[PDB]
Design a protein around this ligand. Structure first.
Ligand SMILES: [Zn+2]
Length: 62
């Protein structure tokens, strides 16, 4: 079993696109909804990000 709808690059590209946004803007969304729902800047595929996932990105993309 398989599907023909996937990120053609990797989640890491979508994560890098989130990492460059203002710290106050990212923190404001987390303080009102606890997570972020966004599309990959390279292929448009959607992914979800939370405070714990962003904390791992801040210790891998820095
Ligand atoms: Zn992608």
């Amino acid at each position: 079993m398989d599907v023909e709808f996937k990120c053609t690059c990797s989640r890491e590209r979508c994560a890098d696109a989130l990492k460059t946004l203002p710290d106050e803007e990212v923190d404001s969304i987390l303080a009102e909804d606890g997570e972020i729902d966004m599309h990959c800047d390279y292929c448009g595929n959607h992914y979800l990000f939370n405070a714990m996932d962003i904390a791992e990105i801040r210790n891998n993309a820095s």
